[PDB]
Design a protein around this ligand. Structure first.
Ligand SMILES: [Zn+2]
Ligand SMILES: [Zn+2]
Ligand SMILES: [Zn+2]
Lengths: 546, 497, 86
């Protein structure tokens, strides 16, 4: 009773240190009388306008826990004064009140929300000032994100003020309106959703301006992402408009249409079945769109490739159709100038390969084209392209074991070139070694016999690399190489004498180190054991020491 | 085996519901769960590690569902997941090498990839449990602050600097909102946020002064996000610079209107008048203004003296730029250059060669600055004679050829970035010391007599939101406060007013 | 021959009331304090730096720190003092 009075007396001491410490002590006490409530509330409200920034920050932080302890009546006046200060001319008042109101909303019931909704709806409709509009829109989005189910009676009121703002000259207002509309749709009634959907279709049926069609398509994509199943009934009407707008010459408009197609494919799978062929055809048509260059237009290509990836990664019953039409387009598009779209199409075909695991026969038939297209890209100076090529080979061999029986002579030199390259990074070397290991583990030993003379030196060099991850990968590859050069369960005519000494010499140094990491120790032990098991008869006097 | 166990549990439930009594349900469920799960916990842990090593999300979810039926059975899984995430992040950062030291994009993208992958795993497989999200947060906080990159720099403050540089790179000249949100997600785990704030303020000031920003909306969104995450004082500090920019624009427009009435000037003139206490820039080196710029200098000085009598203007010549259209070459060339390049280029018009001492006297530029700018000009193929000696003769190369009509010869120097970074880190150190001193003084003002441990605890709980102080620096601050006669010792200190 | 088309310049403004010297002590703002100069070099002499305020007034850190122990008003204006630079 006396400590509170002392704190309130000291919070007006004309010295910043005393005010700061008193506010900190007050916040500590609240985190741990009816008349005292009014004085505390008024003092916090007045310190919101204090000269010192630290005191203002402390007051804003203290407004949070205050609402829980204080009775229901004073929360109303706190909200009222914050909303009133939100419309003041001063910038500091405006933003400090915005932060305080956000803090109040975060720590929170239906009574205050009604007044907040009324004030925000009144403020947003005014277009004279845009800062107030933006702050009110963001606070409404925050209020709708959580405990938004208590505003059932106010949804039409929010709706009729949100929709007029999609034609505002400022783009930030449009984006915040889209966010707020998505949050509203996430939890709302049935009639409001129908009203919004028919409104969007109504002003999409008429093309009033180019700048507004873009934001309408973006909004439809937003509801498609947020609601999902609730928009599947209107796809029969939505799709033809997007198809019509795809053909428009504007480059920016096309990308949003393709993104909307991708969102429809991803979110509502059951109702998108009749339009899958149309979406696939549009994406295939616009995957190779490049008017200036003949063998800013890469955004549409990225969108088309991403939509193809979304289509392939979800549907599993269309695999024959995919291998009939989608795969040749991507394989022909492997040679694209832009690196980002190249990564996108590589990811799309990797998703197709993952979905594959009859389709296997079609994949085997397509393998030669894949190898021919990948061999050209293996010579590029960019690390990312080579990394994607190695990942694709690894995935292809994993899905199909004996895929590359007839293409080892053309595939080995690329791996060799990537391994002994100064510009190559650690990731590229590791991925190349992993690809070589996967290739060796899933092929007949007789294929690699002519290429051992070119495979052994780079691997031996990789064993001595200072970085230990590459050493571990090289030892793992060396084990399989030893198993390959001298098989024990099959008869072979290959001579393994020249390559024994190099492998033993490179492995023994890692075997007796006593300072290297644990993984390299385990790999060295395993590799030396395999060496002794397979080719230990040709070793000299080093076997007892080993 | 996990699928078999689930099927057997469902079958037992059906059995006891159909043709047994209801009093047997709980006992049968307990016995079946114990026999089928609790006796194979070590095997389950080993398989959990194996499935973490080779990504199989469905199996992880099934294991989580199975082990959830045993009291205190999820702790080992949480510990294993935390260790795995920590090791994966460290390995991912280590593979970058020495390139990540000066490439913020690679560093931040690696961190973001690891965090996104394991956040998706936690939400999908583990049903977004509190323990698993806590383990993910702990692992992220461990591997973000200390890693291979921080060991090369011998400090844990490299990560906030790299994050700030990545933000600057993004904001210089639709998907930007997502990456900004991801960056702000990363910012939550940073222990030293003051370094991030200082560096971001520096880069924002540089962006505003030179007018190279992608858009104003992106800047506003970043300010809003920083308001959500950081405090209110930092945002006020940034809004001060924004207001100064607006005031400078208005003053420039007013001066443009004033110039119409009088005689027009011979060149296009724009000025950025800024407050000296709200911006991080420092006083420029000694410099003599070339004679052809004196008209605009005097005109604007007189205009500002008339408009504001009580203020004086200090000119920064290391942040000014302009155009030098030349007609003494093979064809017409226009080039973008700073004031220093103008001084060491416009000085000779009818002559062809100079010695550095004569050029130094003419331009009044210091030694190192002149050497660096001359090196930059020499590698631009606009000057011909590698080391610059005091007796060297430098002459213009006639007939310089370029493949583009517009040429930019304004390239940052090599040592400038390192010097700026070192200065910023030092300044962060003195600000930390001063903040500690101020906190101690305020605490001792509030409490007349206090102990040592209570003082330390209060200082750390007051400064925690920005940086974590150390005991030696707090002790040194206390000792230097005693020397200044602020508090006196009676291990217990008392405030001496 | 070289010709100039445009010139973009950056300038800083500060109060001209003080002739490049501290108000409390009549010494140059880049020099040391009176107490610092009188006393021997020590840890305190290391942290002698100019301090700015919201009102864009610059004094020595030691000078304003000593002044603020008894008062809470800037020497050159009747407004409260708030640090904003070091
Ligand atoms: Zn002084
Ligand atoms: Zn001093
Ligand atoms: Zn003042």
């Amino acid at each position: 009773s006396y400590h509170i009075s002392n704190l309130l007396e000291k919070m007006t001491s004309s010295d910043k240190d005393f005010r700061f410490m008193a506010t900190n002590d007050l916040m500590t006490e609240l985190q741990k009388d009816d008349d005292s409530e009014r004085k505390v509330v008024k003092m916090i409200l007045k310190l919101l306008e204090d000269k010192n920034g630290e005191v203002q920050n402390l007051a804003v932080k203290c407004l949070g826990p205050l609402v829980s302890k204080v009775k229901e009546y004073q929360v109303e006046t706190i909200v009222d004064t914050l909303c009133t200060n939100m419309l003041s001319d001063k910038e500091q008042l405006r933003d400090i009140s915005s932060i305080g109101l956000k803090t109040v909303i975060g720590e929170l019931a239906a009574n205050v929300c009604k007044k907040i909704t009324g004030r925000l709806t009144s403020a947003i409709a005014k277009q004279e000032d845009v800062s107030v509009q933006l702050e009110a829109l963001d606070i409404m989005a925050d209020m709708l994100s959580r405990q938004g189910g208590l505003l059932v009676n106010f949804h039409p009121s929010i709706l009729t003020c949100l929709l007029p703002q999609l034609t505002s000259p400022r783009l930030a207002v449009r984006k915040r309106t889209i966010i707020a509309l998505g949050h509203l749709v996430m939890s709302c009634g049935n009639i409001v959703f129908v009203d919004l959907i028919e409104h969007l279709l109504s002003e999409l049926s008429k093309n009033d301006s180019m700048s507004t069609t873009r934001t309408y398509i973006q909004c439809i994509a937003a509801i498609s992402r947020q609601a999902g199943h609730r928009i599947g009934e209107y796809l029969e009407k939505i799709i033809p408009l997007v198809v019509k707008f795809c053909n428009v010459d504007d480059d920016e408009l096309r990308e949003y249409c393709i993104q909307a197609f991708e969102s429809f494919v991803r979110r509502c799978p059951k109702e998108v079945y009749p339009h899958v062929s149309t979406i696939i055809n549009i994406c295939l048509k616009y995957l190779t769109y490049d008017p200036n260059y003949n063998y800013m237009s890469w955004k549409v290509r990225r969108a088309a490739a991403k939509c193809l990836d979304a289509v392939v990664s979800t549907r599993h019953e269309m695999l024959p159709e995919f291998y009939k039409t989608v795969s040749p387009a991507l394989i022909s598009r492997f040679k694209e100038r832009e690196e980002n779209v190249k990564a996108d199409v590589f990811h799309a075909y990797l998703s197709l390969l993952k979905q594959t695991r009859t389709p296997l026969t079609m994949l085997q038939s397509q393998v030669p084209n894949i190898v021919k297209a990948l061999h050209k890209q293996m010579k590029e100076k960019s690390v990312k392209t080579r990394q994607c090529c190695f990942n694709m080979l690894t995935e292809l061999v994993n899905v199909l074991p004996g895929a590359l029986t007839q293409h080892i002579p053309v595939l080995v030199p690329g791996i060799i070139f990537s391994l002994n390259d100064k510009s190559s990074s650690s990731n590229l070397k590791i991925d190349a070694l992993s690809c070589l290991y996967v290739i060796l583990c899933n092929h007949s030993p007789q294929v690699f016999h002519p290429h051992v003379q070119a495979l052994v030196p780079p691997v031996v060099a990789c064993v001595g690399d200072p970085f230990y991850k590459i050493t571990s990968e090289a030892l793992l590859v060396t084990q399989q190489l030893v198993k390959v050069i001298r098989p024990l369960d099959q008869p072979s005519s290959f001579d393994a004498t020249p390559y024994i000494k190099d492998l033993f010499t490179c492995t023994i140094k890692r075997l007796k180190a006593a300072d290297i990491d644990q993984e390299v120790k385990e790999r060295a032990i395993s590799c030396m054991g395999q060496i002794i098991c397979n080719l230990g008869d040709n070793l000299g006097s080093d076997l007892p020491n080993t | 085996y996990m699928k078999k166990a689930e099927a057997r549990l469902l079958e037992e439930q059906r059995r006891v519901q159909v043709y047994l009594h209801e009093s047997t349900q709980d006992e049968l469920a307990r016995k079946c769960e114990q026999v089928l799960i609790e006796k194979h916990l070590e095997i389950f842990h080993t398989e959990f590690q194996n499935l973490l090593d080779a990504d199989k999300n469905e199996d992880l979810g099934r294991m989580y569902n199975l082990v959830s039926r045993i009291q205190d059975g999820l702790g080992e899984l949480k510990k294993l997941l935390e260790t795995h995430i920590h090791n994966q992040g460290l390995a991912a950062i280590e593979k970058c090498g020495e390139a990540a030291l000066n490439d913020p994009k690679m560093y931040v993208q690696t961190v973001l990839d690891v965090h996104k992958k394991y956040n998706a795993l936690v939400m999908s497989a583990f049903n977004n449990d509190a323990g698993f999200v806590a383990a993910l947060d702990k692992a992220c906080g461990r591997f973000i602050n200390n890693n291979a990159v921080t060991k090369m720099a011998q400090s844990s403050s490299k990560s906030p600097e790299l994050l700030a540089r990545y933000c600057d790179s993004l904001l210089k000249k639709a998907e930007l909102e997502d990456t900004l949100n991801q960056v702000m997600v990363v910012f939550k785990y940073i222990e030293d946020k003051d370094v991030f704030q200082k560096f971001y303020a520096k880069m924002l000031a540089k962006r505003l002064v030179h007018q190279n920003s992608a858009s104003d909306d992106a800047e506003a969104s970043m300010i809003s996000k920083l308001k959500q995450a950081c405090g209110f004082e930092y945002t006020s500090k940034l809004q001060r610079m924004f207001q100064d920019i607006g005031v400078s624009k208005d003053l420039n427009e007013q001066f443009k209107k004033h110039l119409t009435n009088s005689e027009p000037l011979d060149l296009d003139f724009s000025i950025q008048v800024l407050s000296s206490g709200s911006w991080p820039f420092q006083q420029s080196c000694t410099f003599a203004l070339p004679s052809e710029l004196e008209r605009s200098y005097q005109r604007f000085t007189a205009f500002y003296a008339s408009r504001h009598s009580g203020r004086k203007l200090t000119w920064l010549y290391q942040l000014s730029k302009g155009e030098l259209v030349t007609n003494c070459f093979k064809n017409r060339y226009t080039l973008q250059a700073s004031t220093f390049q103008m001084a060491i280029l416009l000085q000779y018009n009818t002559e062809d060669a100079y010695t550095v001492q004569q050029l130094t006297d003419s331009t009044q530029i210091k030694m190192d600055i002149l050497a660096q700018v001359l090196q930059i000009l020499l590698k631009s193929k606009l000057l011909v004679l590698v080391e610059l000696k005091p007796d060297t003769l430098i002459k213009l190369y006639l007939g310089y050829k370029n493949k583009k009509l517009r040429v930019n010869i304004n390239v940052p120097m090599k040592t400038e970035q390192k010097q700026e970074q070192e200065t910023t880190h030092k300044n962060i150190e003195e600000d930390r010391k001063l903040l500690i001193q101020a906190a101690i003084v305020r605490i001792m003002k509030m409490r007349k007599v206090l102990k040592h441990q209570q003082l330390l605890g209060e200082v750390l709980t007051q400064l925690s939101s920005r940086f974590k102080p150390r005991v030696p620096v707090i002790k040194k601050c206390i000792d230097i406060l005693i020397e200044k006669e602020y508090l006196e010792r009676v291990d217990t200190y008392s405030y001496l007013a | 021959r070289f010709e100039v088309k445009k010139w973009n310049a950056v300038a800083l403004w500060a109060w001209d009331i003080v002739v490049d010297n501290c108000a409390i002590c009549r010494n140059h703002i880049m020099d040391l304090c009176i107490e610092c100069q009188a006393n021997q070099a020590s840890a305190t002499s290391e942290e002698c730096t100019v301090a700015w305020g919201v009102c864009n007034h610059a004094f020595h850190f030691h000078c304003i720190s000593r002044w603020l122990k008894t008062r809470q008003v800037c020497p050159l204006d009747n407004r409260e003092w708030e640090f904003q630079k070091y």
